[PDB]
Design an enzyme around this catalytic site. Structure first.
Site, PDB file in Angstrom:
ATOM      1  N   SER A 242       0.843  -1.198   0.000  1.00  0.00           N
ATOM      2  CA  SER A 242       0.000   0.000   0.000  1.00  0.00           C
ATOM      3  C   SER A 242       0.891   1.267   0.000  1.00  0.00           C
ATOM      4  O   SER A 242       0.690   2.193  -0.823  1.00  0.00           O
ATOM      5  CB  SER A 242      -1.030   0.015   1.112  1.00  0.00           C
ATOM      6  OG  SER A 242      -0.494  -0.089   2.374  1.00  0.00           O
ATOM      7  N   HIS A 272      -1.821  -8.751   1.476  1.00  0.00           N
ATOM      8  CA  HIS A 272      -1.554  -7.527   2.222  1.00  0.00           C
ATOM      9  C   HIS A 272      -2.629  -7.145   3.258  1.00  0.00           C
ATOM     10  O   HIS A 272      -2.270  -6.788   4.379  1.00  0.00           O
ATOM     11  CB  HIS A 272      -1.280  -6.393   1.237  1.00  0.00           C
ATOM     12  CG  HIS A 272      -0.803  -5.110   1.857  1.00  0.00           C
ATOM     13  ND1 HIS A 272      -0.316  -5.011   3.143  1.00  0.00           N
ATOM     14  CD2 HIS A 272      -0.701  -3.865   1.326  1.00  0.00           C
ATOM     15  CE1 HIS A 272       0.041  -3.754   3.382  1.00  0.00           C
ATOM     16  NE2 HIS A 272      -0.187  -3.037   2.298  1.00  0.00           N
ATOM     17  N   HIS A 318       7.609 -13.392  12.787  1.00  0.00           N
ATOM     18  CA  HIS A 318       8.136 -12.282  12.026  1.00  0.00           C
ATOM     19  C   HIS A 318       9.566 -12.596  11.602  1.00  0.00           C
ATOM     20  O   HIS A 318      10.340 -13.215  12.326  1.00  0.00           O
ATOM     21  CB  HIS A 318       8.083 -10.978  12.824  1.00  0.00           C
ATOM     22  CG  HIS A 318       8.217  -9.759  11.965  1.00  0.00           C
ATOM     23  ND1 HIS A 318       9.421  -9.377  11.422  1.00  0.00           N
ATOM     24  CD2 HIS A 318       7.305  -8.865  11.514  1.00  0.00           C
ATOM     25  CE1 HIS A 318       9.262  -8.278  10.711  1.00  0.00           C
ATOM     26  NE2 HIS A 318       7.984  -7.953  10.739  1.00  0.00           N
ATOM     27  N   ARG A 327       2.530  -2.828  18.646  1.00  0.00           N
ATOM     28  CA  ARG A 327       1.153  -2.596  18.265  1.00  0.00           C
ATOM     29  C   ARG A 327       0.227  -3.683  18.815  1.00  0.00           C
ATOM     30  O   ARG A 327      -0.956  -3.432  18.998  1.00  0.00           O
ATOM     31  CB  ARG A 327       1.014  -2.467  16.747  1.00  0.00           C
ATOM     32  CG  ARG A 327       1.886  -1.360  16.121  1.00  0.00           C
ATOM     33  CD  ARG A 327       1.887  -1.341  14.628  1.00  0.00           C
ATOM     34  NE  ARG A 327       2.440  -2.576  14.110  1.00  0.00           N
ATOM     35  CZ  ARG A 327       2.304  -3.032  12.875  1.00  0.00           C
ATOM     36  NH1 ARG A 327       1.711  -2.305  11.930  1.00  0.00           N
ATOM     37  NH2 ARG A 327       2.760  -4.232  12.598  1.00  0.00           N
ATOM     38  N   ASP A 373      -2.006  -7.793  14.041  1.00  0.00           N
ATOM     39  CA  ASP A 373      -3.199  -8.498  13.531  1.00  0.00           C
ATOM     40  C   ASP A 373      -3.699  -9.621  14.430  1.00  0.00           C
ATOM     41  O   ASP A 373      -4.848 -10.044  14.283  1.00  0.00           O
ATOM     42  CB  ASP A 373      -2.964  -8.980  12.109  1.00  0.00           C
ATOM     43  CG  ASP A 373      -2.562  -7.820  11.175  1.00  0.00           C
ATOM     44  OD1 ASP A 373      -3.328  -6.828  10.979  1.00  0.00           O
ATOM     45  OD2 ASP A 373      -1.418  -7.909  10.659  1.00  0.00           O
ATOM     46  N   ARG A 399      -4.025   3.959   7.326  1.00  0.00           N
ATOM     47  CA  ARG A 399      -2.803   3.995   6.529  1.00  0.00           C
ATOM     48  C   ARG A 399      -2.719   5.225   5.650  1.00  0.00           C
ATOM     49  O   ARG A 399      -1.610   5.675   5.279  1.00  0.00           O
ATOM     50  CB  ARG A 399      -2.708   2.684   5.739  1.00  0.00           C
ATOM     51  CG  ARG A 399      -1.473   2.506   4.849  1.00  0.00           C
ATOM     52  CD  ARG A 399      -0.204   2.644   5.655  1.00  0.00           C
ATOM     53  NE  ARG A 399      -0.080   1.857   6.892  1.00  0.00           N
ATOM     54  CZ  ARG A 399       0.458   0.638   6.972  1.00  0.00           C
ATOM     55  NH1 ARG A 399       0.892   0.007   5.859  1.00  0.00           N
ATOM     56  NH2 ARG A 399       0.573   0.069   8.150  1.00  0.00           N
ATOM     57  N   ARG A 419      11.499   4.492 -11.373  1.00  0.00           N
ATOM     58  CA  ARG A 419      11.766   3.859 -12.656  1.00  0.00           C
ATOM     59  C   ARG A 419      12.927   2.857 -12.514  1.00  0.00           C
ATOM     60  O   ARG A 419      14.018   3.102 -13.034  1.00  0.00           O
ATOM     61  CB  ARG A 419      12.088   4.936 -13.679  1.00  0.00           C
ATOM     62  CG  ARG A 419      11.998   4.429 -15.081  1.00  0.00           C
ATOM     63  CD  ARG A 419      12.648   5.397 -16.072  1.00  0.00           C
ATOM     64  NE  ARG A 419      11.882   6.549 -16.575  1.00  0.00           N
ATOM     65  CZ  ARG A 419      10.731   6.501 -17.262  1.00  0.00           C
ATOM     66  NH1 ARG A 419      10.061   5.364 -17.411  1.00  0.00           N
ATOM     67  NH2 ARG A 419      10.193   7.640 -17.741  1.00  0.00           N
TER      68      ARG A 419
HETATM   69 CL   LIG Z   1       1.742  -2.882   6.668  1.00  0.00          CL
END
Ligand SMILES: [Cl-]
Ligand SMILES: [Cl-]
Lengths: 434, 434
Positions: A242, A272, A318, A327, A373, A399, A419
């Site tokens: 994102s 995602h 992780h 979090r 999450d 976000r 690019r």
């Molecule tokens: Cl994220």
């Protein structure tokens, strides 16, 4: 003093100078190598972009302009009588690098309330979306259609000097942030509240509170959760899909509406945007099978049985982070204060003491601590926000804060079109033979 | 004639080739990463594998190894036509093989069969206001078309990773089929007072159904459209539209979401406006010097332009050493079909004069024009004067390339694109540590 735009106008030249000095000192210094495997492997491990708003500390977790989550909880302004950090102050921090005062946050809350209106074509479009169009698709399409309101797009087409791009980018970002809860609440009410009205914006309320009002919630504690949720999901470096999509699209001088809408199409991807939902589904089925107060002993057996059957425990593990995601911790602390009797939270807490050692013993997961999450779905559900398909929309609203804070800076600092060079397999074979 | 079965046979062979290559060369270094590369949009960095097209720095873009003149000769034409059908270009990009007449006829029929739009998308298009840019209409409609994604639905149900490509293919075929209907509706709603696009004719090729739906009937405009849609189809993976499709696709967002994100990138002024910029410049030039300008007078105007620090739009390239083959084919077309057009005559006079002046000056390294130097004058000749809409045509073309690659990205199991970002503070620390 309180106008964020004037504060930004003072900070930008100083940062431009600091960056120019660093690039004049080290522009051709090598910081990494690119391998064939990185090209096939989604740029895994390739240092690729400059993204200023947040950095992952592998020992401590995500930091927001150098501040940890617990530091932000302590230092960022709260609502009057509240204890959770207002997302306005998080945005101020991400944009300025500075902890806002009470007065600056109050100013920003008023700005976002003033800017919140939706044009009638977007209201019509929202109301016409069918219920089989995914809420994330509704979100992205509506934000794209809001580019009719982009002052950057209009001004660029007329002609504007490159030194002023950030000014109109800032205006469009502020406008988009302001409008997001209205868009998101309309989707919510149209899908799940039979098309009832979102009601009006209150000029004296903070962003999260206008949002929960528009969603149709009234619980002061849910608004506190939402303030925390929107602060903590706000940013997580630039490499996530994102963030990177917003950056990439932004680099073509697409306005913030187009850039954020593209980012939402990336967030919609199952790799995602679905972790919260996956966890909650798994917890729900577990609790139905073993019941509401399974012993620690029995839950461990359930986890081993899960892993021995080839499945993973959602929300745990992780690649880099060496402790529990901060979090996750802040959500745990919230739950312990406000909903300690809840059966689903008690299961989440039991898993926290059991799962990590089982994953370490199993020896496959690296760093088997839980992430954000693992904890969010149970809190949402406790307050009545049970529509799991909609959870990625909440993530997207959060976000916005991080990716739009960085987009302002990308334009202020004159970052060019992104690019990289692609090659085909035939081309790579030829190159490596040479 | 089943493209899907031909693909099923090719996929294992490519998977095996890549596995063998990566076994030996996965760790082989192909470039260095510097500080300036990170600030400069990954300039120069070989960062992704994109199989469908490769730029030859001597000769220009090649489509699975074939040059544009080779494609003009070898790809099937419409009955009584001379320009290559885009159907055949797509077949080539997907398979690496030149299609037969029968295979192209099959693919034309497939795309005619699949073209239907759901009511909600038709309604949404008809409700867009006339100040919503055509590219925003396009992206929003494609996002809303994800209601029709079979990959999205099937993935949520469970699909084996080795088979993702199958439903990706079906959704890409469906999207390509629907694109001209969406694009034609935008055109007629904005510029033809909302008149009907009419019906699909199952006996016509894709470009011809498209020009019919736009309201054009000139046989030579349909020929132009076949050429235009073939030549703009793909240009490696590093351009923003290609890369955005790739990035979003890597999160397993379906082809509708991925393509819509790509369109938001194409909409950016640094990617999708070159045609328009050239035509604006040519229009002003022709007004200033008139239609009978001598070579001598135009040369003097060009020197004066360059001596004043200004550039000629459409001329110059960092890498390509000669005229873009996509410019050449448009020149050839104009010479056959509109050699009398005054704006084309100016374009042709500039081709004679501008590169010579740049070579004499000795500063520009590759003084030749690109595709965008020539496209606007052809569109305008046929009555397609709505410059804002030109990027929609580019987008319809570019679907062919980016969706051909999306099929292959999924077939080959390319992972989530996730480069590493760093902050300025982080880079300063990294450099000082080493
Ligand atoms: Cl994220
Ligand atoms: Cl391109």
């Amino acid at each position: 003093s309180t106008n964020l735009k004037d504060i930004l106008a003072d900070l930008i030249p100083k940062e431009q100078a600091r960056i120019k000095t660093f690039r004049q000192q080290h522009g051709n210094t090598v910081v990494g190598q690119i391998t064939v495997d990185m090209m096939y492997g989604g740029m895994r491990g390739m240092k690729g972009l400059v993204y200023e708003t947040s950095v992952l500390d592998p020992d401590e977790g995500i930091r927001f302009r150098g501040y940890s989550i617990p530091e932000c909880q302590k230092m960022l302004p709260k609502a009057k009588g509240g204890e959770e950090p207002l997302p306005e102050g998080l945005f101020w921090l991400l944009v300025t690098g500075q902890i806002p005062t009470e007065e600056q946050v109050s100013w920003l809350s008023k700005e976002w309330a003033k800017r919140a209106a939706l044009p009638s074509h977007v209201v019509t479009m929202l109301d016409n979306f069918p219920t089989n169009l995914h809420p994330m698709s509704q979100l992205s399409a509506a934000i794209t259609a809001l580019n009719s309101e982009s002052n950057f797009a209009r001004a660029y087409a007329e002609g504007i000097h490159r030194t002023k791009y950030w000014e109109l980018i800032y205006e469009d970002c502020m406008d988009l942030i302001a409008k997001l809860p209205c868009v998101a609440a309309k989707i919510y009410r149209n899908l799940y509240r039979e098309g009832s009205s979102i009601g009006a914006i209150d000029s004296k309320l903070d962003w999260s509170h206008n949002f929960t009002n528009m969603l149709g919630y009234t619980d002061a504690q849910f608004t506190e959760l939402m303030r925390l949720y929107l602060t903590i999901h706000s940013d997580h470096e630039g490499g996530n899909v994102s963030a990177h999509t917003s950056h990439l699209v932004g680099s073509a001088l697409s306005d913030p509406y187009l850039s954020f809408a593209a980012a939402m199409n990336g967030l919609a991807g199952p790799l995602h945007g679905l972790a919260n939902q996956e966890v909650l589904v798994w917890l729900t089925q577990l609790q139905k099978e073993v019941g509401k107060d399974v012993s620690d002993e029995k839950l461990r057996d359930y986890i081993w049985n899960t892993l021995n059957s080839g499945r993973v425990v959602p929300g745990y593990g992780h690649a880099v982070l060496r402790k529990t995601d901060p979090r996750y911790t802040c959500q745990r602390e919230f739950a312990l204060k406000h909903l300690p009797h809840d059966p689903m939270f008690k299961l989440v807490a039991q898993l926290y003491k059991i799962v990590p050692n089982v994953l370490l013993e199993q020896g496959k997961a690296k760093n088997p601590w839980p992430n954000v999450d693992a904890h969010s779905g149970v809190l949402l559900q406790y307050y009545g926000m049970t529509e799991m398909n909609y959870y990625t929309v909440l993530f997207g609203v959060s976000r916005a804060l991080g990716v739009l804070a960085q987009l302002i800076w990308s334009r202020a600092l004159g970052f060019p079109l992104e690019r990289p060079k692609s090659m085909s397999t035939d081309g790579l074979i030829k190159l490596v033979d040479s």
